[PDB]
Design a protein around this ligand. Structure first.
Ligand SMILES: O=C(O)c1ccc(C(=O)NCCO)cc1
Length: 494
């Protein structure tokens, strides 16, 4: 047992195998009932010692779709008191350790800070204090309502980072050397936080794994989403009304909304905009004129975050996670790809560029590469291009290792780098297989520690001339210049 006094009361953690670990430290009061929709409230001070040996409840979430869910096996924990954070440090009484703060992904609807694959022990054993946490998700986190502040989930993330600022020195960390990092929705959250004055000084460096500054819900779309949710619940689209809905009913309707938007929305239900594809993620942060007055990429184009060191990257075959496991790909037709390209204003022959660069010969494979570029690769490069004159540094990676799961159909799909970053390969066998290469997890994890420690991951910085990134792969990880250049240029005016 090991007892540490936070700014609001003592907590009891555990010191085993050379590392002190604290689980379930509250940073915000339970968001119950009407407080599903209020700003996060600092926990009520306490006397005595709060037990911090066990992960807390996690935020309410519906199951992943079955195929995805078979690859990403989530660990649910029941309860109401879920706005908590977790700390791993090698020595609470050390001074000046780098701090990493993880923001989990999961399309703003799923995930938790305490998933087994996000274990922080490997970072602590390398001399870094590691923090993870839960934030509000789905309707509760992000649905926009006239009588509630927008983007509670983002308010939660700011509150957790403010706890780290005001408490991490008591766990051995330097609050002036905080690296925030996330994957997918967590990385889009990092770009959103870089973009708002409300979070300046809460971190010195950022790592963006498969997420950029393109994910925001237009206020008029968020209103439509709320109206459909309330109609199916038989209530008014207000916090006053949704405060009383049993959570299982909230989740069931939330699930149907997400399925409908990820497919081909029915204009009769969703209006012309959403049926036309204006919404990529229906519970992404809304443009509120408070935290978001524009898409984060445009704030960053305006100089937001230019003082924060940046490490960014994507996987080679990102979108294959969402298209391949459900057998969708063999049925895709050339005319469908052409029509897809035509919504972005590109001619039919743009698909040949993908074939010429080895990014697909069949329409379905070409489609997956196109959407990989539109949602992940190009948005990441736009942030990097925006930082040409930034005083801080910018480094890039491509995670190219391909998983063998599902008979090789995924490639280097979305989320595949996570257990390599955390050296938790043995907890992600459903995604990476039973014998992934530990040497690569060593390489990737060590570069993350180097970047947290010094602001340099150990390879040349990214610039718009050579567009150099570190290509992570198993036998050999090595630098490459401007990968996939022809397919990149297709999007220049787009
Ligand atoms: O564009 C999408 O459809 C999408 C983007 C990001 C996520 C995510 O943050 N989690 C990874 C697996 O859910 C999910 C879906």
């Amino acid at each position: 047992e090991i007892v540490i006094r936070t700014g609001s009361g003592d907590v009891r953690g555990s010191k085993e195998n050379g590392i002190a670990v604290f689980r379930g430290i509250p940073y915000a009061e339970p968001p119950v009932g009407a407080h599903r929709f209020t700003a996060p409230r600092p926990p009520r001070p306490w006397d005595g010692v709060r037990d911090a040996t066990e992960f807390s409840a996690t935020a309410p979430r519906p199951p992943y779709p079955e195929a995805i869910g078979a690859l990403l096996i989530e660990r649910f924990i029941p309860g109401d008191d879920y706005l908590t954070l977790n700390v791993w440090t090698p020595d609470p009484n050390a001074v000046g350790l780098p701090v990493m703060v993880w923001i989990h992904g999961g399309a703003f609807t799923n995930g938790s800070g305490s998933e087994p694959v996000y274990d922080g022990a490997a970072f602590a054993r390398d001399g870094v204090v590691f923090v993870s946490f839960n934030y509000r998700l789905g309707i509760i986190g992000f649905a926009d309502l006239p009588d509630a502040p927008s983007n509670r989930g983002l308010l939660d993330q700011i509150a957790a980072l403010e706890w780290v600022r005001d408490n991490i020195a008591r766990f051995g960390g330097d609050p002036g050397n905080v690296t925030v990092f996330g994957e997918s929705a967590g990385a889009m959250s990092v770009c959103t936080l870089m973009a708002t004055p409300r979070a300046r000084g809460l971190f010195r460096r950022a790592i963006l794994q498969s997420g950029a500054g393109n994910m925001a819900v237009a206020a008029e779309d968020a209103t439509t989403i709320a109206a459909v949710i309330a109609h199916r619940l038989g209530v008014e689209p207000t916090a006053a009304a949704l405060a009383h809905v049993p959570v299982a009913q909230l989740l069931d309707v939330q699930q149907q909304v997400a399925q409908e938007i990820q497919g081909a929305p029915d204009p009769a239900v969703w209006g012309e905009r959403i049926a036309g594809g204006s919404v990529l993620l229906p519970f992404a942060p809304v443009i509120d004129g408070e935290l978001l007055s524009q898409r984060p990429a445009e704030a960053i184009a305006g100089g937001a975050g230019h003082d924060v060191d940046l490490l960014f990257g994507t996987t080679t075959d990102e979108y294959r996670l969402f298209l391949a496991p459900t057998g969708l790909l063999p049925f895709i037709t050339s005319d469908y790809v052409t029509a897809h390209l035509a919504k972005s204003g590109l001619d039919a022959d743009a698909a040949k560029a993908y074939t010429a660069e080895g990014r697909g010969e069949e329409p379905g494979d070409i489609l997956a590469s196109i959407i990989t570029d539109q949602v992940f690769r190009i948005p990441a490069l736009r942030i990097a291009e925006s930082r040409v004159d930034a005083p801080a540094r910018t480094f890039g990676y491509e995670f190219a290792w391909r998983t063998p799961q599902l008979d090789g159909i995924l490639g280097a799909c979305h989320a595949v780098e996570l257990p390599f970053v955390f050296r938790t390969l043995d907890r992600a066998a459903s995604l990476v297989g039973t014998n992934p290469p530990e040497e690569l997890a060593e390489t990737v994890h060590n570069a993350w520690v180097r970047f947290a420690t010094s602001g340099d991951p150990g390879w040349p910085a990214w610039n718009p001339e050579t567009r150099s990134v570190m290509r992570f792969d198993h036998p050999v990880s090595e630098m490459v210049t401007d990968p996939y250049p022809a397919t990149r240029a297709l999007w220049d005016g787009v």
